[PDB]
């Protein structure tokens, strides 16, 4: 465990990350894919054998020892908002069972389904609010992974309201 288990927001490239291991935005087969999931698979590749998984799960792939954990949230383009709201919240739980399972002490990690999967719709508080969920019970430094400017400020607000 980390000694005193915190979140954390940066605002870089998911590939840069300095904790004990990844998870990667991915698709339900393994595919290289884009944004996140492409950044993953230049930096990672070997962590794409046998990786495909069903949507709401996660699937965990060593690239040497760096622990890759292939989490598969839902488009929203193709479920339901409630139907993908139940995918999205199992997706975070199987990354918290991961994330235990392997013994890390910290993890990086992006918010499943904001991007190209997100059906055109800002799912910042939806997907952040999962990841909570998930992750509270963990005692691994969690450190979030963003792009945009507004959203890193967003995420470090929502971190700091609960001290
Ligand atoms: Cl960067
Ligand atoms: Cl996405
Ligand atoms: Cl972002």
Same mark, same amino acid.
């Given at each position: 465990?980390?000694?005193?288990?915190?979140?954390?927001?940066?605002?870089?490239?998911?590939?840069?990350? /300095?904790?004990? &291991?990844? =998870? @990667? $935005? $991915?698709?339900?087969?393994?595919?290289?894919? /884009?944004?996140?999931?492409?950044?993953?698979?230049?930096?990672?590749?070997?962590?794409?054998?046998?990786?495909?998984?069903?949507?709401?799960?996660?699937?965990?792939?060593? &690239?040497?020892?760096?622990?890759?954990?292939? $989490?598969?949230?839902? @488009?929203?383009? @193709?479920?339901?908002?409630?139907?993908? /709201?139940?995918?999205?919240?199992?997706?975070?739980?199987? =990354?918290?069972?991961?994330?235990?399972?392997?013994?890390? !002490?910290?993890?990086?990690?992006?918010?499943?389904?904001?991007?190209?999967?997100?059906?055109?719709?800002?799912?910042?508080?939806?997907? +952040? !609010?999962? +990841?909570?969920?998930?992750?509270?019970?963990?005692?691994?430094?969690?450190?979030?992974? &963003?792009?945009?400017?507004?959203?890193?400020?967003?995420?470090?607000?929502?971190?700091?309201?609960?001290?």
């Amino acid at each position: 465990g980390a000694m005193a288990p915190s979140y954390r927001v940066k605002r870089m490239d998911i590939a840069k990350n /300095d904790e004990e &291991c990844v =998870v @990667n $935005a $991915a698709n339900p087969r393994g595919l290289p894919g /884009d944004g996140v999931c492409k950044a993953v698979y230049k930096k990672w590749p070997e962590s794409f054998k046998n990786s495909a998984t069903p949507v709401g799960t996660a699937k965990t792939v060593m &690239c040497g020892t760096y622990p890759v954990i292939h $989490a598969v949230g839902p @488009n929203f383009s @193709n479920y339901t908002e409630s139907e993908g /709201d139940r995918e999205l919240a199992a997706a975070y739980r199987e =990354v918290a069972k991961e994330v235990t399972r392997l013994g890390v !002490n910290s993890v990086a990690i992006p918010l499943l389904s904001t991007g190209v999967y997100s059906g055109g719709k800002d799912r910042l508080t939806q997907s +952040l !609010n999962h +990841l909570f969920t998930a992750m509270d019970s963990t005692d691994a430094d969690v450190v979030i992974y &963003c792009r945009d400017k507004e959203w890193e400020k967003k995420i470090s607000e929502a971190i700091q309201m609960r001290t």
